[PDB]
């Protein structure tokens, strides 16, 4: 399975979306931030060639997204959610980050949100290139017209890193 994903994971300008179920994987609340931190240092590090922002959609409630946002802020990682309180904003989620090449600065590096009807509609508006469903999710309101639907199955974050070519051993 790892060798089947390497050709797609080698393109710098390629949009990847993630659909993750927190319950399927173990120790999600204490290792998801580290997984994001060591995913972007490898796939979203270059300021010119890595020109598309990853999107992580978690099957959880809105009230749990603030904790993830503040945990990310504590680690000095800039992300957007699209929620401020309990109201979702279409413009904020779909905005394109601004880049300053001479300063190696980008305003945000990930779109971390929850699984909801409003969020799913935003995904369909701007279709991605690869979609990774992790843990098993319905995904019945998403337009899979010209999008790869590679289903990844794991039991821990080490396996996900091994599959995504971020670690040489299981």
């Amino acid at each position: 399975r790892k060798n089947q994903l390497v050709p797609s994971l080698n393109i710098n300008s390629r949009s990847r979306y993630f659909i993750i179920d927190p319950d399927t994987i173990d120790n999600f609340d204490d290792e998801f931030i580290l997984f994001v931190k060591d995913y972007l240092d490898k796939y979203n590090s270059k300021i010119k060639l890595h020109t598309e922002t990853p999107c992580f959609i978690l099957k959880t409630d809105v009230n749990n997204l603030s904790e993830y946002h503040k945990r990310f802020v504590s680690r000095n990682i800039q992300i957007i959610t699209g929620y401020i309180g309990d109201t979702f904003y279409f413009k904020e989620f779909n905005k394109e980050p601004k880049r300053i090449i001479k300063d190696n600065w980008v305003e945000f590096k990930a779109r971390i949100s929850c699984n909801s009807d409003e969020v799913i509609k935003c995904i369909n508006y701007k279709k991605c290139d690869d979609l990774y469903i992790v843990g098993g999710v319905d995904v019945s309101l998403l337009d899979t017209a010209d999008v790869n639907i590679e289903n990844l199955e794991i039991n821990n974050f080490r396996e996900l890193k091994y599959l995504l070519s971020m670690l040489k051993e299981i």
């Binding site: 710098n12 270059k46 300021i47 010119k48 060639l49």
Partner: protein
């Protein structure tokens, strides 16, 4: 004239797709892509390899 120029002209002599070395001038790198010197771990696979027909020359 207060113009700092540090330009190196290099020539491709192979690729490192995976854990093995393939020769040939192909897969031109995109602009603004880092150069990372070279490590002894990857140089020990291009030359040393592993086979009975190995002759050391320093």
């Amino acid at each position: 004239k207060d113009e700092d120029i540090f330009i190196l002209t290099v020539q491709p002599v192979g690729i490192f797709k995976g854990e093995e070395f393939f020769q040939g001038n192909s897969m031109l790198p995109s602009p603004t892509e880092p150069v990372f010197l070279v490590e002894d771990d990857i140089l020990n696979k291009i030359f040393s390899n592993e086979k009975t027909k190995i002759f050391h020359l320093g």
